[PDB]
Design a binder for this molecule. Structure first.
Ligand SMILES: O=c1ccn([C@@H]2O[C@H](COP(=O)(O)OP(=O)(O)O[C@H]3O[C@H](CO)[C@@H](O)[C@H](O)[C@H]3F)[C@@H](O)[C@H]2O)c(=O)[nH]1
Ligand SMILES: Oc1cc(Cl)c(Cl)cc1Cl
Length: 462
């Protein structure tokens, strides 16, 4: 049976959808999978747990940590994570040597959006390289266009006076392009660009999205183009929130249907002091029920990407006033279970794509609060094109004040404003079901890929 090797780049937002993708490969298609895990230090924590309790058809190899101690502590995350894959190639080659010895040379090597240098090892071993793309078809289009964009545009992107509007894509202002594009002199941009120039080497790109969610972008991506690999929407691949977990879910059990606003800023997002304070005050002001996963504030929006009690940062009396109607949990919540809970009615999110898909699958309307990476691009998509998210208004200084927090929260949870998005998410919840049926468009696309892999293995062994 084909053996697929999956090489994620660091980040829970990459490992989680890759684990869901692997489970579908083994359960639906009878393949075997090995995760090969690169890291700049020892594996977490959450990494070992997400890779725990998987069918025996899925194994994990943790590589020796690579040495990135030569890098500035101010190095951007995208540099760190791309380099982690790049510098792990020697160790990845040893793993592929063991696969050859075990009669299990992979049929494909699947990297994610920042791990294309692993293609060097795939090519050396005559293994087809593929990318699993954990974010939108809109942002995939941007990555595919980036080599041309880079060539044709010579200013920093924030200086563009017209928005970029790729075929089938929501327009995005240069100042809203994903964070690592925002400083072309930084190695974050060089690693972004380098990765995108390698996309044409992929035999196919599987994207965690679905037709009804991004119909125009998907149609455009699937049109033949110069050096453009085939693109397969295979989503939404999410944890549907049916696994066994506690205190926050007990609290949730005691709230009315559709009444709770879940608030979470991903696996690594934080707010500034000033913004954390205004958000807290606005949540309390709103008088809505809320479940907030809280991290300590920082001037760096992705500072917990990979300490202090976050509750010590909350304003005077905040925990007292909200003691019944609000549940504040430090660091991490069982998000899949929360979004699937009947008492959840809304989601204030950083627009991480896994959180977005989870919310879609459960029909939970959003407040779009982007922080870093490509989240702003996602927010513009979700609010202006898909129309399943409301956006808060930020002042000219970039702060979303308590009045606006309370306005948008009430608007989502009870207002006319929130009716449009709530209806839209209902339609998307239904379409998310449709596409993953035996003959749904996402299942068909994944099936075609798995069929290609089976045929490749067949021709090789015979
Ligand atoms: O308290 C918590 C918090 C999160 N989780 C789970 O962690 C995953 C969060 O992934 P998500 O894509 O929303 O955010 P993040 O990891 O910041 O995204 C990066 O990777 C994403 C994929 O490329 C990208 O769109 C984004 O911009 C990047 F920043 C998602 O499956 C949540 O259910 C949880 O269980 N409990
Ligand atoms: O998962 C990611 C996806 C994207 Cl598009 C960026 Cl820019 C950064 C991270 Cl960490």
């Amino acid at each position: 049976t084909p053996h697929v090797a999956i090489i994620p780049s660091p980040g829970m937002g990459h490992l989680i959808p890759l684990v869901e993708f692997a489970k579908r490969l083994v359960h639906l298609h009878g393949l075997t999978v090995t995760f090969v895990i690169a890291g700049e230090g020892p594996p977490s924590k959450a990494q070992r747990t997400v890779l725990d309790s998987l069918p025996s058809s899925i194994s994990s190899v943790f590589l020796p940590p690579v040495d990135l101690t030569d890098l500035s502590s101010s190095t951007r995350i995208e540099s760190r994570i791309s380099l982690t894959v790049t510098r792990s190639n020697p160790e990845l080659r040893k793993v592929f040597d063991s696969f050859v010895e075990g009669g299990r040379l992979p049929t494909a090597l699947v990297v994610d959006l920042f791990g294309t240098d692993a293609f060097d090892v795939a090519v050396e071993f005559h293994v087809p390289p593929y990318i699993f793309y954990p974010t939108t078809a809109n942002v995939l289009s941007f990555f595919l266009h980036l080599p041309k964009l880079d060539e044709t545009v010579s200013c920093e992107f924030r200086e563009l006076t017209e928005p970029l509007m790729l075929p089938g894509c929501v327009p995005v202002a240069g100042k809203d392009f994903l964070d690592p594009a925002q400083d072309r002199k930084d190695d974050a941009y060089k690693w972004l660009l380098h990765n995108t120039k390698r996309y044409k080497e992929a035999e196919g790109i599987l994207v965690n999205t679905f037709f009804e969610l991004e119909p125009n972008a998907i149609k455009a991506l699937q049109e033949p183009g110069l050096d453009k690999p085939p693109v397969y929407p295979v989503g939404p691949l999410v944890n549907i929130g049916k696994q066994e977990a506690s205190e926050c879910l007990k609290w949730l059990d005691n709230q009315p249907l559709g009444s709770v606003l879940y608030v979470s800023f991903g696996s690594g997002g934080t707010l500034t002091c000033e913004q954390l304070n205004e958000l807290a005050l606005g949540l309390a002001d709103s008088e809505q029920r809320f479940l907030w996963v809280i991290r300590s504030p920082s001037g760096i929006a992705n500072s917990s990407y990979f300490q202090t009690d976050p509750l010590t940062f909350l304003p005077p009396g905040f925990l007292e006033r909200t003691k019944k109607r609000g549940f504040v949990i430090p660091f991490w919540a069982p998000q899949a279970q929360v979004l699937a809970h009947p008492s959840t009615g809304g989601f204030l999110t950083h627009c991480g794509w896994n959180s977005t898909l989870e919310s879609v699958v459960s029909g939970i309307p959003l407040i779009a609060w982007p922080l870093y990476a490509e989240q702003k691009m996602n927010a513009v998509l979700l609010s202006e094109d898909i129309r399943a998210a409301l956006r808060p208004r930020a002042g000219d200084d970039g702060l979303v004040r308590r009045e606006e927090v309370a306005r948008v929260v009430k608007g989502l949870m009870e207002g006319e404003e929130g009716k449009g998005v709530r209806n839209k998410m209902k339609e998307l919840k239904e379409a998310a079901c449709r596409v993953l049926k035996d003959d749904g468009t996402s299942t068909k696309a994944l099936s075609l890929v798995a069929l290609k892999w089976k045929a490749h293995k067949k021709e090789l062994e015979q």
